[PDB]
């Protein structure tokens, strides 16, 4: 008598609702009822205290129930699924924080960058190794965090009247990344104090030198453009500032090492950079 | 009593030999006892009278008994295994013939070109569609042939005293290809009359407009460099010259359409063009 | 299969039947560009001539594969090969074949 | 995009220009949803 067409039809949750129409969406809300290796690459995760799996979900390939694109996607599986090391960011005493957009960091690097450029569609999760070596006499903490759909906001002219939008070097800063001008609101008006509801790991220098967050592919879509859409933003921010006495190593680098996990590329055409 | 170490040990042929040493190689010689689709691409082979499989061997992937490289090779399987169309060559009345070196034609094209550049090792066979449309009032024949390890020779200064070697634009002419300066000796001192012992197909214009030679990977090695080593040379030569009356289409193009078949790339490093 | 007006250049009323077909002619033998159209059925352009495209006017969202049948209407003696390339959405207009 | 893969090759006596009729349709996996008013035909003159 009724189209099974509410928003929770495909979900695993039973709903006792009231309906009077042939559309299930017309119904009531109702109530219910250590060496890591990938590719030709190897990292070390002895001092991280665990590896964070983003939302408890391993980066699987696209489910055939879940995909829409009828073209056979390519899975290069070693040549693109491998640790990619970006250029280092120097953690300083005045380091506000940096972000990296994904897979915008890797659309210009490796066969992953070519597969991102040559294919319209892209799907991968990510093993993100953020490492920061410091001595036992250095101190400071990094919130290494994965903010999905990290839409950058502007200062809006500072006052708030100008409707600015962040430039392409800011929304998609590539493998270099972009600093946080305002890490407290994450350049997005949302507090970094609540950033740990996102997949996060602390680089507390006394405790661990590296953070390994393993991120699944997070989208409303089974695949997307690797060039336009950035599925998430990795945020590496000094919540506790870097401190050391003079004589200790002042150059404290944060190296960002990225494994695309189960990369899947569909819609092959010419190589397009953006 | 004897090392099994002759050159025919791994072969399927039994040899009754005489030996007096512990090496089997020391022994005597003895005596014994229509739409083709790959990737996102489709060709038409209605007028070819068959498809030539090179040496009766389909381009399989590398056998695990046959491989040596311990790194896991990537098989992109759709994004590189697909028909690649080169720029056309105009068959003329004075066309001597052209050649194309493999996979040198495709080291700069597609994800195959990137996988050839990013990987030291390469292995693929080839589905080679050579097509030449001409009317029922045009005439001429092409020997479309696959000469494996097509080493180009020079004119040796013409007289024979100069020890010339062909330049890189001649040994590896890319997707454009190189004409035959002397098609009778195939620019190699070997007769084109005997070129049909190699995998060959005739484009006899009255009979067929296209030639589809399917070439396996032919090497002494399971993999090789796609940049240095060219596994074979495709030769498209007008044995019978193109002829037509004035008024018929003088522009008779030969389009070269190439499918790498079961491409396998190992030894991932930076993208190297040569 | 309804006629796709790939040749949606002649707005002239005497030339509106020229919109239903487009001129393959003898070329210089390169990969010359014959015709170009977006593959969007509901878009303002060549697909509005189709029944698919006009029914796509009545719906917001569409999914599924599209067929475009290209029918050569030259002579039996006319021969030749076309590369009909669907470009996935990221690619711009290809400069070459 | 349509590209000349070889060329339009014609003999004497047959026309040097031909025509392609493109016939576009949808496959059996095609669907539509969110039934809306059409913009592909706007009425301008009032129907008397």
């Amino acid at each position: 008598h009724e189209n099974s067409n509410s928003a929770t039809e495909g979900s695993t949750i039973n709903y006792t609702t009231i309906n009077y129409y042939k559309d299930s969406y017309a119904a009531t809300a109702g109530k219910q009822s250590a060496q890591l290796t990938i590719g030709n690459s190897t990292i070390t995760t002895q001092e991280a205290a665990n590896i964070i799996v983003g939302y408890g979900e391993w980066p699987s390939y696209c489910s055939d129930d879940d995909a829409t694109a009828v073209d056979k996607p390519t899975r290069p599986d070693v040549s693109v699924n491998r640790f990619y090391t970006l250029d280092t960011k120097l953690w300083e005493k005045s380091s506000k924080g940096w972000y990296w957009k994904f897979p915008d960091v890797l659309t210009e690097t490796g066969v992953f960058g070519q597969n991102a450029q040559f294919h319209y569609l892209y799907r991968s999760g990510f093993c993100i190794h953020v490492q920061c070596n410091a001595s036992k006499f250095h101190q400071g903490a990094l919130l290494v965090a994965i903010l999905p759909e990290y839409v950058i906001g502007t200062v809006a002219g500072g006052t708030g009247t100008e409707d600015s939008h962040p430039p392409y070097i800011q929304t998609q800063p590539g493998a270099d990344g972009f600093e946080l001008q305002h890490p407290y609101v994450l350049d997005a008006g949302i507090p970094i104090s609540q950033l740990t509801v996102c997949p996060h790991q602390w680089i507390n220098l006394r405790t661990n030198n590296c953070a390994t967050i393993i991120v699944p592919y997070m989208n409303t879509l089974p695949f997307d453009s690797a060039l336009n859409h950035c599925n998430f933003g990795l945020l590496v921010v000094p919540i506790s500032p870097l401190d050391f006495d003079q004589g200790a190593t002042p150059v404290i680098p944060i190296t960002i090492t990225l494994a695309p996990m189960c990369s899947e590329f569909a819609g092959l055409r010419q190589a397009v950079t953006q | 009593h004897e090392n099994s170490n002759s050159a025919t040990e791994g072969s399927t042929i039994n040899y009754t030999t005489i030996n007096y040493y512990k090496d089997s190689y020391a022994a005597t010689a003895g005596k014994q006892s229509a739409q083709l689709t790959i990737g996102n691409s489709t060709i038409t082979t209605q007028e070819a009278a068959n498809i030539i499989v090179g040496y009766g061997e389909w381009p399989s992937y590398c056998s695990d008994d046959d491989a040596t490289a311990v790194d896991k090779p990537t098989r992109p399987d759709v994004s590189v295994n697909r028909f690649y169309t080169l720029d056309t060559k105009l068959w003329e009345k004075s066309s001597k013939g052209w050649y194309w070196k493999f996979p040198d034609v495709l080291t700069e094209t597609g994800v195959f070109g990137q996988n050839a550049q990013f990987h030291y090792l390469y292995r693929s066979g080839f589905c080679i569609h050579v097509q030449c449309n001409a009317s029922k009032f045009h005439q001429g024949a092409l020997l479309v042939a696959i000469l494996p390890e097509y080493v180009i020779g020079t004119v040796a200064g013409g007289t024979g005293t100069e020890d010339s070697h062909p330049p890189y634009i001649q040994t590896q002419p890319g997707a454009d290809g190189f004409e035959l300066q002397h098609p009778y000796v195939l620019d190699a001192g070997i007769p084109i009359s005997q070129l049909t012992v190699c995998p060959h197909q005739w484009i006899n214009l009255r009979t067929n407009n296209c030639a589809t030679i399917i070439v396996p990977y032919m090497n002494t090695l399971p993999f090789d460099s796609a940049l240095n080593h060219c596994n074979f040379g495709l030769l498209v030569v007008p044995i019978s010259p193109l002829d037509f009356d004035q008024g018929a289409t003088p522009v008779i193009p030969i389009t070269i359409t190439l499918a790498p078949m079961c491409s396998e790339f190992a030894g991932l490093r930076q993208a190297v063009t040569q | 299969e309804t006629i796709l007006e790939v040749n949606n250049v002649p707005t002239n009323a005497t030339s509106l039947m020229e919109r239903l077909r487009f001129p393959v002619s003898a070329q210089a033998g390169k990969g010359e560009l014959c015709a170009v159209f977006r593959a969007d059925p509901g878009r303002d352009g060549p697909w509005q001539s189709t029944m698919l495209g006009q029914l796509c006017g009545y719906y917001t969202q569409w999914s599924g594969s599209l067929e475009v049948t290209f029918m050569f209407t030259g002579s039996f003696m006319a021969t030749g090969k076309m590369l009909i390339a669907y470009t996935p959405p990221g690619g711009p207009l290809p400069k070459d074949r | 995009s349509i590209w000349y893969q070889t060329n339009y090759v014609v003999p004497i006596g047959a026309p040097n220009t031909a025509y392609i009729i493109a016939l576009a349709a949808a496959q059996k996996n095609f669907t539509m949803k969110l039934c809306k008013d059409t913009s592909h035909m706007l009425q301008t003159a009032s129907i008397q």
């Binding site: 055939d64 694109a69 056979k72 569909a266 | - | - | 496959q27």
Partner: peptide
């Protein structure tokens, strides 16, 4: 006409309503 008569095709378990 079909789509793996045309390209390489993946299994799409398509629940799109008509």
């Amino acid at each position: 006409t079909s789509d793996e008569s045309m390209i390489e095709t993946r299994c799409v378990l398509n629940s799109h309503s008509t």
